[PDB]
PDB file of C-alpha atoms in Angstrom:
ATOM      1  CA  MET A   1      80.077 111.451  94.902  1.00 40.34           C
ATOM      2  CA  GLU A   2      82.076 111.046  91.615  1.00 38.29           C
ATOM      3  CA  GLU A   3      85.091 112.914  93.181  1.00 41.37           C
ATOM      4  CA  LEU A   4      84.600 111.072  96.542  1.00 43.96           C
ATOM      5  CA  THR A   5      84.771 107.709  94.662  1.00 43.94           C
ATOM      6  CA  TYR A   6      88.074 108.850  93.015  1.00 44.86           C
ATOM      7  CA  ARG A   7      89.639 110.002  96.366  1.00 45.16           C
ATOM      8  CA  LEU A   8      88.616 106.612  97.912  1.00 43.30           C
ATOM      9  CA  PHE A   9      90.350 104.691  95.024  1.00 44.40           C
ATOM     10  CA  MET A  10      93.556 106.663  95.859  1.00 45.77           C
ATOM     11  CA  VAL A  11      93.138 105.977  99.637  1.00 47.32           C
ATOM     12  CA  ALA A  12      92.559 102.248  98.831  1.00 47.20           C
ATOM     13  CA  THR A  13      95.692 102.241  96.602  1.00 45.56           C
ATOM     14  CA  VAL A  14      97.819 103.595  99.496  1.00 45.30           C
ATOM     15  CA  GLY A  15      96.097 101.347 102.106  1.00 44.94           C
ATOM     16  CA  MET A  16      96.682  98.185 100.014  1.00 43.07           C
ATOM     17  CA  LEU A  17     100.402  99.006  99.450  1.00 42.61           C
ATOM     18  CA  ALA A  18     100.791  99.787 103.205  1.00 42.60           C
ATOM     19  CA  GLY A  19      99.263  96.367 104.001  1.00 40.13           C
ATOM     20  CA  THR A  20     101.506  94.603 101.428  1.00 37.09           C
ATOM     21  CA  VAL A  21     104.751  96.070 102.891  1.00 39.73           C
ATOM     22  CA  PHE A  22     103.543  95.653 106.544  1.00 39.25           C
ATOM     23  CA  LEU A  23     102.825  91.934 105.919  1.00 40.59           C
ATOM     24  CA  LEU A  24     106.123  91.308 103.983  1.00 38.94           C
ATOM     25  CA  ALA A  25     108.156  93.090 106.756  1.00 40.09           C
ATOM     26  CA  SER A  26     106.202  91.245 109.560  1.00 41.54           C
ATOM     27  CA  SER A  27     106.716  87.832 107.789  1.00 43.03           C
ATOM     28  CA  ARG A  28     110.222  87.667 109.438  1.00 42.25           C
ATOM     29  CA  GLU A  29     108.722  87.779 113.020  1.00 44.44           C
ATOM     30  CA  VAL A  30     106.961  84.400 112.351  1.00 45.95           C
ATOM     31  CA  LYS A  31     108.601  80.915 111.993  1.00 45.04           C
ATOM     32  CA  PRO A  32     109.234  79.671 108.410  1.00 44.41           C
ATOM     33  CA  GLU A  33     106.630  76.830 108.544  1.00 44.26           C
ATOM     34  CA  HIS A  34     103.896  79.451 109.415  1.00 47.82           C
ATOM     35  CA  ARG A  35     104.882  82.159 106.819  1.00 49.42           C
ATOM     36  CA  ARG A  36     102.880  80.822 103.785  1.00 53.34           C
ATOM     37  CA  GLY A  37      99.580  82.533 104.822  1.00 53.81           C
ATOM     38  CA  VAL A  38     101.383  85.859 105.542  1.00 54.72           C
ATOM     39  CA  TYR A  39     103.089  85.790 102.058  1.00 52.02           C
ATOM     40  CA  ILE A  40      99.726  85.038 100.324  1.00 49.92           C
ATOM     41  CA  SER A  41      98.057  87.836 102.417  1.00 48.50           C
ATOM     42  CA  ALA A  42     100.706  90.332 101.139  1.00 46.19           C
ATOM     43  CA  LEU A  43     100.174  89.080  97.530  1.00 48.11           C
ATOM     44  CA  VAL A  44      96.390  89.711  97.921  1.00 48.74           C
ATOM     45  CA  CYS A  45      97.069  93.328  99.092  1.00 51.25           C
ATOM     46  CA  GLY A  46      99.629  93.821  96.246  1.00 53.40           C
ATOM     47  CA  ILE A  47      97.201  92.639  93.514  1.00 56.10           C
ATOM     48  CA  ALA A  48      94.509  94.979  95.001  1.00 55.95           C
ATOM     49  CA  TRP A  49      97.086  97.855  95.108  1.00 54.38           C
ATOM     50  CA  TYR A  50      97.727  97.319  91.354  1.00 51.68           C
ATOM     51  CA  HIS A  51      93.971  97.100  90.540  1.00 54.54           C
ATOM     52  CA  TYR A  52      93.023 100.198  92.664  1.00 51.27           C
ATOM     53  CA  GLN A  53      95.641 102.231  90.707  1.00 51.74           C
ATOM     54  CA  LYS A  54      93.948 101.002  87.462  1.00 51.14           C
ATOM     55  CA  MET A  55      90.418 101.671  88.837  1.00 51.30           C
ATOM     56  CA  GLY A  56      91.512 105.237  89.846  1.00 55.10           C
ATOM     57  CA  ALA A  57      92.942 106.036  86.360  1.00 56.73           C
ATOM     58  CA  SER A  58      89.935 104.265  84.666  1.00 53.09           C
ATOM     59  CA  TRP A  59      87.535 106.430  86.786  1.00 51.06           C
ATOM     60  CA  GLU A  60      89.452 109.713  86.015  1.00 52.33           C
ATOM     61  CA  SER A  61      89.434 109.037  82.216  1.00 49.15           C
ATOM     62  CA  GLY A  62      85.645 108.580  82.139  1.00 49.73           C
ATOM     63  CA  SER A  63      84.287 105.226  80.817  1.00 49.98           C
ATOM     64  CA  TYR A  64      85.025 103.472  84.201  1.00 51.71           C
ATOM     65  CA  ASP A  65      85.627  99.698  83.559  1.00 53.34           C
ATOM     66  CA  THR A  66      83.322  97.892  86.108  1.00 55.58           C
ATOM     67  CA  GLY A  67      85.094  94.628  85.018  1.00 56.62           C
ATOM     68  CA  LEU A  68      88.389  95.683  86.740  1.00 56.39           C
ATOM     69  CA  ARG A  69      86.689  95.054  90.137  1.00 59.59           C
ATOM     70  CA  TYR A  70      85.744  91.474  89.063  1.00 62.32           C
ATOM     71  CA  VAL A  71      89.249  90.776  87.659  1.00 63.95           C
ATOM     72  CA  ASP A  72      90.537  91.803  91.140  1.00 64.66           C
ATOM     73  CA  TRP A  73      87.912  89.647  92.959  1.00 66.38           C
ATOM     74  CA  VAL A  74      88.408  86.510  90.786  1.00 66.74           C
ATOM     75  CA  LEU A  75      92.146  86.531  91.715  1.00 71.43           C
ATOM     76  CA  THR A  76      92.009  87.800  95.352  1.00 69.35           C
ATOM     77  CA  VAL A  77      88.880  86.015  96.721  1.00 71.77           C
ATOM     78  CA  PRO A  78      90.215  82.464  96.061  1.00 71.66           C
ATOM     79  CA  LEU A  79      93.656  83.596  97.436  1.00 73.80           C
ATOM     80  CA  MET A  80      91.922  84.927 100.621  1.00 73.09           C
ATOM     81  CA  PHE A  81      90.491  81.403 101.277  1.00 72.20           C
ATOM     82  CA  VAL A  82      94.009  80.027 100.546  1.00 70.84           C
ATOM     83  CA  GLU A  83      95.703  82.391 103.079  1.00 70.97           C
ATOM     84  CA  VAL A  84      93.223  81.117 105.776  1.00 74.61           C
ATOM     85  CA  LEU A  85      93.755  77.441 104.726  1.00 75.37           C
ATOM     86  CA  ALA A  86      97.569  78.136 104.935  1.00 76.85           C
ATOM     87  CA  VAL A  87      97.209  78.664 108.761  1.00 77.96           C
ATOM     88  CA  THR A  88      94.534  75.942 109.410  1.00 77.86           C
ATOM     89  CA  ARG A  89      96.004  73.103 107.226  1.00 76.83           C
ATOM     90  CA  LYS A  90      99.261  71.624 105.784  1.00 75.94           C
ATOM     91  CA  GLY A  91     100.235  68.823 103.316  1.00 74.76           C
ATOM     92  CA  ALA A  92      97.513  66.914 101.368  1.00 75.97           C
ATOM     93  CA  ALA A  93      94.610  68.401 103.475  1.00 71.49           C
ATOM     94  CA  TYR A  94      95.728  71.960 102.471  1.00 69.91           C
ATOM     95  CA  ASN A  95      96.136  71.093  98.716  1.00 71.94           C
ATOM     96  CA  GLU A  96      92.651  69.423  98.743  1.00 74.26           C
ATOM     97  CA  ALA A  97      90.984  72.535 100.281  1.00 78.09           C
ATOM     98  CA  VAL A  98      93.022  74.996  98.093  1.00 80.61           C
ATOM     99  CA  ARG A  99      91.625  73.264  94.945  1.00 82.78           C
ATOM    100  CA  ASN A 100      88.035  72.772  96.264  1.00 82.17           C
ATOM    101  CA  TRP A 101      87.505  76.159  98.069  1.00 78.71           C
ATOM    102  CA  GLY A 102      89.530  77.938  95.299  1.00 82.33           C
ATOM    103  CA  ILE A 103      87.282  76.593  92.478  1.00 85.98           C
ATOM    104  CA  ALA A 104      84.125  77.371  94.579  1.00 86.55           C
ATOM    105  CA  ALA A 105      85.349  80.992  95.134  1.00 88.85           C
ATOM    106  CA  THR A 106      86.158  81.317  91.384  1.00 89.12           C
ATOM    107  CA  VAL A 107      82.630  80.025  90.500  1.00 87.75           C
ATOM    108  CA  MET A 108      81.078  82.505  93.004  1.00 90.36           C
ATOM    109  CA  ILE A 109      82.865  85.513  91.375  1.00 87.76           C
ATOM    110  CA  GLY A 110      82.235  84.133  87.827  1.00 86.24           C
ATOM    111  CA  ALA A 111      78.469  83.709  88.501  1.00 83.60           C
ATOM    112  CA  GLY A 112      78.449  87.248  89.995  1.00 84.28           C
ATOM    113  CA  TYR A 113      80.119  88.625  86.834  1.00 82.92           C
ATOM    114  CA  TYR A 114      77.620  86.703  84.627  1.00 82.94           C
ATOM    115  CA  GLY A 115      74.804  88.424  86.595  1.00 82.13           C
ATOM    116  CA  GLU A 116      76.532  91.845  86.849  1.00 82.00           C
ATOM    117  CA  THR A 117      76.952  92.069  83.009  1.00 86.44           C
ATOM    118  CA  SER A 118      73.124  91.518  82.669  1.00 87.11           C
ATOM    119  CA  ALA A 119      70.265  94.062  82.898  1.00 88.89           C
ATOM    120  CA  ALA A 120      69.477  94.495  86.658  1.00 88.53           C
ATOM    121  CA  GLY A 121      66.430  92.405  87.755  1.00 89.55           C
ATOM    122  CA  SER A 122      66.789  90.284  84.565  1.00 88.60           C
ATOM    123  CA  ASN A 123      66.719  86.435  84.454  1.00 89.10           C
ATOM    124  CA  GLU A 124      70.563  86.403  83.952  1.00 87.14           C
ATOM    125  CA  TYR A 125      70.961  88.767  86.987  1.00 88.78           C
ATOM    126  CA  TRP A 126      68.927  86.426  89.274  1.00 87.09           C
ATOM    127  CA  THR A 127      70.728  83.289  87.934  1.00 86.30           C
ATOM    128  CA  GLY A 128      74.131  84.866  88.740  1.00 88.36           C
ATOM    129  CA  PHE A 129      72.876  85.961  92.184  1.00 86.95           C
ATOM    130  CA  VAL A 130      71.441  82.528  93.182  1.00 86.37           C
ATOM    131  CA  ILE A 131      74.546  80.497  92.034  1.00 84.29           C
ATOM    132  CA  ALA A 132      76.962  83.013  93.656  1.00 86.53           C
ATOM    133  CA  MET A 133      74.815  83.226  96.879  1.00 85.54           C
ATOM    134  CA  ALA A 134      74.655  79.358  97.150  1.00 89.02           C
ATOM    135  CA  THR A 135      78.475  79.136  96.671  1.00 87.82           C
ATOM    136  CA  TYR A 136      78.952  81.983  99.236  1.00 91.15           C
ATOM    137  CA  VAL A 137      76.861  80.123 101.873  1.00 90.95           C
ATOM    138  CA  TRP A 138      78.742  76.842 101.084  1.00 92.90           C
ATOM    139  CA  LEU A 139      82.116  78.630 101.646  1.00 91.91           C
ATOM    140  CA  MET A 140      80.925  80.358 104.908  1.00 93.60           C
ATOM    141  CA  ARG A 141      79.751  76.916 106.186  1.00 92.17           C
ATOM    142  CA  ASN A 142      83.187  75.404 105.263  1.00 93.82           C
ATOM    143  CA  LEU A 143      84.860  78.322 107.152  1.00 97.41           C
ATOM    144  CA  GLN A 144      82.658  77.721 110.272  1.00 95.23           C
ATOM    145  CA  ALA A 145      83.576  73.958 110.242  1.00 95.99           C
ATOM    146  CA  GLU A 146      87.337  74.762 109.857  1.00 97.97           C
ATOM    147  CA  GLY A 147      87.369  76.012 113.507  1.00 97.99           C
ATOM    148  CA  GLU A 148      86.054  72.722 115.020  1.00 95.26           C
ATOM    149  CA  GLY A 149      88.762  71.095 117.214  1.00 96.93           C
ATOM    150  CA  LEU A 150      90.906  74.261 117.674  1.00 96.38           C
ATOM    151  CA  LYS A 151      91.813  75.099 121.326  1.00 95.57           C
ATOM    152  CA  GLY A 152      92.944  78.074 123.447  1.00 93.55           C
ATOM    153  CA  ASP A 153      94.811  80.886 121.645  1.00 94.94           C
ATOM    154  CA  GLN A 154      94.443  79.302 118.133  1.00 97.58           C
ATOM    155  CA  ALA A 155      90.639  78.916 118.642  1.00 93.80           C
ATOM    156  CA  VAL A 156      90.440  82.653 119.560  1.00 93.41           C
ATOM    157  CA  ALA A 157      92.737  83.722 116.663  1.00 91.98           C
ATOM    158  CA  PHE A 158      90.700  81.629 114.147  1.00 90.54           C
ATOM    159  CA  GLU A 159      87.371  82.981 115.542  1.00 89.83           C
ATOM    160  CA  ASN A 160      88.602  86.513 114.561  1.00 91.05           C
ATOM    161  CA  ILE A 161      89.648  85.352 111.016  1.00 92.61           C
ATOM    162  CA  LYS A 162      86.280  83.559 110.573  1.00 95.32           C
ATOM    163  CA  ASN A 163      84.159  86.483 111.872  1.00 96.95           C
ATOM    164  CA  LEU A 164      85.970  89.161 109.767  1.00 96.90           C
ATOM    165  CA  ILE A 165      84.953  87.148 106.653  1.00 96.72           C
ATOM    166  CA  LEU A 166      81.429  86.226 107.957  1.00 99.04           C
ATOM    167  CA  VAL A 167      80.576  89.874 108.866  1.00 98.63           C
ATOM    168  CA  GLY A 168      82.913  91.764 106.483  1.00 97.46           C
ATOM    169  CA  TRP A 169      81.839  90.037 103.226  1.00 98.37           C
ATOM    170  CA  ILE A 170      78.004  90.514 103.680  1.00 96.53           C
ATOM    171  CA  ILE A 171      78.310  93.960 101.997  1.00 98.16           C
ATOM    172  CA  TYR A 172      79.281  92.330  98.634  1.00100.36           C
ATOM    173  CA  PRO A 173      75.996  90.425  97.986  1.00100.07           C
ATOM    174  CA  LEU A 174      74.018  93.327  99.614  1.00 99.60           C
ATOM    175  CA  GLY A 175      75.596  95.767  97.098  1.00 99.49           C
ATOM    176  CA  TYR A 176      74.686  93.360  94.224  1.00 99.67           C
ATOM    177  CA  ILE A 177      70.962  93.336  95.253  1.00 97.30           C
ATOM    178  CA  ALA A 178      70.858  97.127  95.975  1.00101.24           C
ATOM    179  CA  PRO A 179      70.251  98.210  92.329  1.00 97.71           C
ATOM    180  CA  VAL A 180      66.972  96.128  92.223  1.00 99.34           C
ATOM    181  CA  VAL A 181      65.595  98.021  95.312  1.00102.17           C
ATOM    182  CA  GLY A 182      66.582 101.449  93.847  1.00104.08           C
ATOM    183  CA  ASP A 183      69.453 103.664  92.530  1.00103.10           C
ATOM    184  CA  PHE A 184      72.580 102.724  94.608  1.00102.83           C
ATOM    185  CA  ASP A 185      75.440 102.514  91.983  1.00104.34           C
ATOM    186  CA  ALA A 186      77.507 105.496  93.319  1.00105.12           C
ATOM    187  CA  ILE A 187      77.250 104.432  97.026  1.00104.66           C
ATOM    188  CA  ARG A 188      77.945 100.749  96.116  1.00105.70           C
ATOM    189  CA  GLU A 189      81.364 101.710  94.577  1.00107.30           C
ATOM    190  CA  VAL A 190      82.251 103.748  97.719  1.00107.84           C
ATOM    191  CA  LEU A 191      81.196 100.961 100.152  1.00106.68           C
ATOM    192  CA  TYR A 192      82.912  98.186  98.117  1.00102.32           C
ATOM    193  CA  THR A 193      86.171 100.249  98.143  1.00104.27           C
ATOM    194  CA  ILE A 194      86.071 100.757 101.961  1.00105.75           C
ATOM    195  CA  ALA A 195      85.068  97.057 102.385  1.00105.92           C
ATOM    196  CA  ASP A 196      88.017  95.833 100.209  1.00106.84           C
ATOM    197  CA  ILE A 197      90.574  97.806 102.329  1.00104.03           C
ATOM    198  CA  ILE A 198      89.175  96.450 105.640  1.00106.62           C
ATOM    199  CA  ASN A 199      88.679  92.883 104.337  1.00105.32           C
ATOM    200  CA  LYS A 200      92.064  92.508 102.591  1.00107.17           C
ATOM    201  CA  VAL A 201      94.396  94.340 105.039  1.00105.92           C
ATOM    202  CA  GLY A 202      92.336  93.149 108.056  1.00105.79           C
ATOM    203  CA  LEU A 203      92.410  89.468 106.996  1.00101.89           C
ATOM    204  CA  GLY A 204      96.198  89.663 106.383  1.00104.33           C
ATOM    205  CA  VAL A 205      96.748  91.113 109.905  1.00 99.41           C
ATOM    206  CA  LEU A 206      94.537  88.392 111.489  1.00100.60           C
ATOM    207  CA  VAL A 207      96.331  85.615 109.499  1.00 99.10           C
ATOM    208  CA  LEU A 208      99.672  87.126 110.696  1.00102.08           C
ATOM    209  CA  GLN A 209      98.259  87.042 114.300  1.00103.28           C
ATOM    210  CA  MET A 210      97.329  83.334 113.830  1.00103.43           C
ATOM    211  CA  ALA A 211     100.864  82.545 112.497  1.00102.91           C
ATOM    212  CA  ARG A 212     102.363  84.475 115.508  1.00 98.06           C
ATOM    213  CA  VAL A 213     100.276  82.250 117.898  1.00 98.31           C
ATOM    214  CA  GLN A 214     101.317  79.068 115.955  1.00 97.13           C
ATOM    215  CA  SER A 215     104.989  80.292 116.286  1.00 98.15           C
ATOM    216  CA  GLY A 216     104.647  80.498 120.138  1.00 97.27           C
ATOM    217  CA  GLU A 217     104.213  84.342 120.169  1.00 99.15           C
TER     218      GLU A 217
END
């Protein structure tokens, strides 16, 4: 399970880079005014590629830095909301949501980190959990409302974006709670790694699909 975790970091590294280059190369098949979300999606995969290389080396060396994961999340999670907003909004409405959802996502990861760097089951741990969980629910409710008014092919394409996040992100708070119910540290690293590949590359592909639909594809 220590070796497995290392192999998975290497598979994630290669998966994230594959997603980055796929999304950059596919960006040309979409019209310029719909490319923003695809570019941001590739940036998310590229940041994760860089971090998974660091997590792999950090793991190998011993003294694994559990903070690398949170540095990756605090950058990529706000950007993942932004890449969705890039295909649902434009102009002032987009900039408003980028700031508001972006700060909320940053607070969620920050509260999580506050709790993570505490003794498990401690007061600090539960404070982090509750603030992050409240912000998570607020963001998922914002995402649900973002679909209202969409029609036909864009409604279907957004439903897929929305449901990948709604279903795919549940593992993160579940992993956080795990250690209070028992000893789950090793499995949590493995599941988070698999989750990050699916969530980051998957969301980029679905945002690309939305931009394709918006481009008349």
